[PDB]
């Protein structure tokens, strides 16, 4: 999806 914080984000 649209996660934008620290580290690996999936969807």
């Amino acid at each position, epitope marked *: 999806x649209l996660l934008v914080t620290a580290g690996l*984000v999936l969807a």
Partner: antibody
Amino acid sequence: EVKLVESGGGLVQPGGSLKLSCATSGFTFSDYYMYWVRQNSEKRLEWVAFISNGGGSAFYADIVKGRFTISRDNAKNTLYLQMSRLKSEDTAMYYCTRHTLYDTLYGNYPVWFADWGQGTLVTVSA
Amino acid sequence: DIQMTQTTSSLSASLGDRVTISCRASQDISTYLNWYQQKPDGTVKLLIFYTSRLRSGVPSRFSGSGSGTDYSLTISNLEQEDIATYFCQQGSRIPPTFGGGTKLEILR
């Protein structure tokens, strides 16, 4: 390409308010998180705030939390920093950028400062 | 915040040379480190992200490694064009904190 153009700098007395804008083109603004970053005379870069593509969440660096409000008009491709209660410390070149989620095999890597604009200077002084 | 430390703030090398810019984090930043290039006129661009991964449009000449707290940008073959100031930034914790920069000068 992608264009981030910031306008709005100039002198403001300490205690004043100024409002920056950042005109964005060549990409669907509504899908990007937007950010402000600032750099002072000593060349130190500083993150000041970010707002989610929807407008819902805005997050702040402690030094500007309570004094600066971030906002966007998704309809006009423009992002804002309303700056109030300025202190001379706030004197800096202000930049605006968009996020980009890069593809890793096992997750996406979030870059907050992928595409930067040219910048706009604010000098805070009497 | 995490403090980023760039060992050198100015280095000069000849065209053709290999230059390694270094960065050091006060804490383990898990390879979540990015490099930026700010050229003499204020313009800034992403050069490398997730410590070794180059973004598109950037020369193969730029490579980046690291583990833990120690990171490097190597510019394999200095070209004229590389005069700029290079900044590492950690993305492990909030806030993003930037290093102080290394200005590169070309010896001639």
